[PDB]
Amino acid sequence: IDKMVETTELMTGNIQSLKNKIQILASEVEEEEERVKQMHQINSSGVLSLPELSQKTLKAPTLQKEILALIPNQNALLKDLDILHNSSQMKSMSTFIEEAYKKLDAS
Applying CB under 8 A, which residues contact other proteins?
A: 1, 4, 7-8, 11-12, 14-15, 18, 22, 25-26, 28-29, 32-33, 36, 40-42, 44-45, 47-50, 52-54, 56-58, 60, 62-64, 66-68, 70, 74-75, 77-78, 80-82, 84-85, 87, 89-90, 92-94, 96-102, 104-105, 107
Helix, coil or strand: residue 4: helix
Q: How many helices and strands in the chain, by DSSP H and E?
A: 6, 0
Minimum distance between the CB of residue 69 and other proteins, rounded to whole angstroms? 12
Q: How far apart are CA 63 and CA 54, in angstroms?
A: 18
Minimum distance between the CB of residue 6 and other proteins, rounded to whole angstroms? 11
Minimum distance between the CB of residue 24 and other proteins, rounded to whole angstroms? 11
Nearest to 84 by CA among 94, 98, 74, 96: 94
Minimum distance between the CB of residue 101 and other proteins, rounded to whole angstroms? 4
Q: How far apart are CA 85 and CA 87, in angstroms?
A: 6
